[PDB]
């Protein structure tokens, strides 16, 4: 009837009841409680570069269960740590080359990051630094200057630039690395990066191994206009950041009619992408992610930046980000619990520490965890 | 995924008195023991335990060959045993034997069948008056069947019951008051048997009754036996102690860890607590047997072994 139990387990746990009606609840509390334990979970340093660590820790060059990769990496994108409109043009960069996004100070390659490209990349003194291991700079030297990127060079690394003299071109620099290979593209506004760390995680997720790129238009440039060689493109944010005139310079440029995803605040169009069918298809998504929206500080959108790729290449179903530090708005609630199958979901990943405890809670609810 | 039975450590002694008992009564023929996956021996009667002394110096063989392995047991140590095992061929002591005979002898007086009215059918004379069915005195158990006074047998073949001799009754069964003569009331031979263990027990639901019969006879029954247990007749069981503490949770107590301070104390593996899961609902809406869901002592039950302990946070 029963089995020959492990002997390293140290309890045997019956559980009892008059009607299997009681049994079979205490059975599914418990089904949940455990995946919950093990499945929720917090990832965050206690500073922006040290937070975007801990995530390369966990997902790269890992023995976790959900990590992108066990093993060596080849290359590692770079961001300055305060350079958001970078590193948003970036996340799809850093999910096709199979890197980790990470944070750097502008004067000086900080110390924790430099060890940590050493044990993402697994460099030793006794094994040779070959070709095949690199670094991408996305931004110019007003974001991450000469100096760091020397340091880098010093130790026998490759450091490949994307950039230009101001915002436009560089995310064109990084967009034309980025395979376009396909007719998507997204389009953001220089103002207006709430509703552009939206589509991050979106333009993260591959196919093929082909991540979709994002360009940065004024709300066009010359280049840009031969870049968007007829594309179907999506207007991610509202009319403040791009206009229906710009919106009409994609329709004649392209001859495409581009599509527009919008909200009135910046969790509305969180909530927006969220319900977009051909983002995450209804009833299926299981793994989520949560991150501070900048309501009380515009600067604390940085650590949706290096989460965006990791939720776009988790498991094998992607994953949002939820972008709330205080609180979770209605459109958030509904589009979460709709967007959740009947089970529940299998994943809650909690980026940086400055989100109230309320906020994680309400998760766990809609989700059933 | 390894069928068998687990003992907690602080219930060894429990555990393998019942082995004991076993070896002494011929339903165990052999019992493999092992240290933490090793070998170390093996208890077996000498000449198919014939004789009760050596039925009893294998039980002494097996608790000294593991009772300080067992008392002394630590964090990852196991024992493990493989009882081959033949319910048939169980024996019972002479106290055994003497123990059921006087609970059939106080069947001796019980009423099989009640005596005739002119509305009901019970016991009536074999001849009529006025060619009109008229009443008879009840049938005792004594009157169809003779109990036996002892036992027969020896400590090391074992003790028996012999059947009780029947016996006939010219008696009949009908109704008073009808012209139609009673009918007759004969014993069941297929339905007397003679008891000496062999697995099994006496049947009191189907013993000395009274059953009519389609064209209106009478048959009685004797000693009926039934299985003591639904487990099959011969196999090899495995059996093993861990130094595992035994944990109780009675969602119907006073007080109980709810399943949240359960996953909060330990961490399960989730195939085993879903597959758990699963076994209850096909119970409860399709009726399907499962092993992992029993029904003891009027209660219904699982048994996880959770991995270990849920780190601190
Ligand atoms: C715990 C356990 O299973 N004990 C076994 C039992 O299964 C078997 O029926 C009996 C022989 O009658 O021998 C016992 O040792």
Do not use: H
């Given at each position: ?47 922006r570069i040290?937070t975007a ?24 994108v770079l961001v300055g740590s305060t350079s958001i409109v970078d590193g948003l043009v970036a996340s ?9 996004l990470?944070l750097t100070?502008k ?31 996305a931004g110019?030297?007003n974001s991450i ?22 915002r436009?071109?560089t995310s064109?620099?990084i ?13 953001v506004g220089g103002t207006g990066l709430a509703d552009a760390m939206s589509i991050a ?13 994002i360009?940065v ?20 944010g509202?009319?403040?950041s ?24 910046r ?24 991150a501070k929206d900048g309501?009380?500080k515009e600067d604390q959108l940085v650590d949706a930046l290096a989460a965006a ?12 980000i939820?972008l ?27 980026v940086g ?17 | ?313």
């Amino acid at each position: 009837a029963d089995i020959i139990a492990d002997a390293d387990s140290p309890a045997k746990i019956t559980i009892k009841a008059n009607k299997l009606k009681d049994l079979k609840d205490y059975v599914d509390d418990l089904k949940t409680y455990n995946n919950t334990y093990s499945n929720v979970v917090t990832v965050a340093g206690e500073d922006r570069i040290e937070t975007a660590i801990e995530l390369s820790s966990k997902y790269y060059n890992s023995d976790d269960k959900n990590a992108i990769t066990d093993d060596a990496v080849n290359n590692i994108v770079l961001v300055g740590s305060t350079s958001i409109v970078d590193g948003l043009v970036a996340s799809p960069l850093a999910s096709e080359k199979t890197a980790p996004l990470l944070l750097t100070s502008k004067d000086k390659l900080d110390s924790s990051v430099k060890s940590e490209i050493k044990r993402v990349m697994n460099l030793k003194s006794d094994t040779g630094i070959n070709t095949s291991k690199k670094v991408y700079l996305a931004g110019g030297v007003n974001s991450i200057s000469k100096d760091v990127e020397n340091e880098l060079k010093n130790m026998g690394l490759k450091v490949t630039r994307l950039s230009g003299e101001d915002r436009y071109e560089t995310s064109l620099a990084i967009a034309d690395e980025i395979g376009l290979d396909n007719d998507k593209a997204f389009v953001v506004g220089g103002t207006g990066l709430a509703d552009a760390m939206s589509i991050a995680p979106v333009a993260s997720q591959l196919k093929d191994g082909d991540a979709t790129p994002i360009v940065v238009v004024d709300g066009i440039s010359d280049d840009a206009k031969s870049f968007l060689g007829t594309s179907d493109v999506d207007i991610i944010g509202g009319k403040n950041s791009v206009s229906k005139e710009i919106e009409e310079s994609i329709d004649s440029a392209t001859g495409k009619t581009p599509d527009r995803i919008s909200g009135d605040d910046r969790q509305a169009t969180n909530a927006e992408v969220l319900k977009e069918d051909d983002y995450f298809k209804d009833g299926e998504v299981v793994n989520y992610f949560v991150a501070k929206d900048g309501s009380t500080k515009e600067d604390q959108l940085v650590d949706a930046l290096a989460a965006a790729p990791i939720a776009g290449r988790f498991k094998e179903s992607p994953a949002p980000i939820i972008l709330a530090t205080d609180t979770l708005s209605s459109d958030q609630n509904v589009a979460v619990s709709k967007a959740v199958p009947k089970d529940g979901g299998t994943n809650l990943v909690q980026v940086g520490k400055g989100i109230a405890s309320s906020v994680i809670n309400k998760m766990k609810d809609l989700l059933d965890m | 995924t390894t069928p068998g039975y687990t003992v907690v450590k602080n219930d060894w002694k429990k555990a393998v008195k019942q082995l004991q008992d076993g070896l002494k009564n011929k339903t165990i023929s052999t019992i493999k023991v092992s240290f933490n996956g090793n070998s170390v021996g093996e208890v077996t009667p000498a000449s198919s335990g014939a004789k009760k002394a050596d039925r009893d110096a294998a039980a002494e063989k097996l608790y000294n060959l593991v009772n300080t392995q067992l008392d002394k047991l630590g964090d990852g140590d196991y024992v493990d045993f493989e009882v081959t095992y033949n319910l048939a061929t169980q024996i019972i002591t002479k106290a055994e034997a003497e123990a059921v005979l006087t609970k059939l002898q106080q069947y001796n007086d019980k009423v099989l069948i009640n005596s005739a009215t002119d509305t009901v059918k019970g016991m009536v004379s074999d001849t009529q008056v006025d060619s009109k069915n008229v009443a008879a005195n009840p049938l005792k158990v004594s009157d169809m069947y003779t109990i036996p006074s002892a036992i027969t047998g020896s400590d090391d073949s074992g003790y028996s019951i012999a059947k009780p001799t029947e016996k006939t009754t010219s008696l009949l069964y009908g109704t008073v008051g009808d012209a139609t003569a009673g009918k007759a009331i004969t014993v069941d031979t297929a339905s007397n048997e003679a008891f000496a263990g062999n697995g099994k027990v006496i049947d009191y639901n189907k013993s000395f009754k009274a059953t009519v019969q389609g064209d209106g006879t009478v048959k009685t029954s004797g000693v009926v036996l039934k299985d003591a247990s639904d487990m099959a007749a011969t196999g090899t069981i495995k059996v093993r102690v861990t130094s595992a503490k035994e944990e109780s949770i009675d969602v119907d107590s006073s007080s109980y860890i709810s399943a949240e301070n359960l996953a909060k104390k330990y961490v399960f593996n989730p195939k085993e607590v879903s597959e758990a899961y699963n076994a209850i609902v096909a119970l409860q809406n399709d009726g399907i047997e499962s092993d992992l869901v029993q029904l003891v002592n009027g209660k219904y039950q699982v048994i996880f072994y959770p991995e270990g302990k849920r780190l601190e946070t």
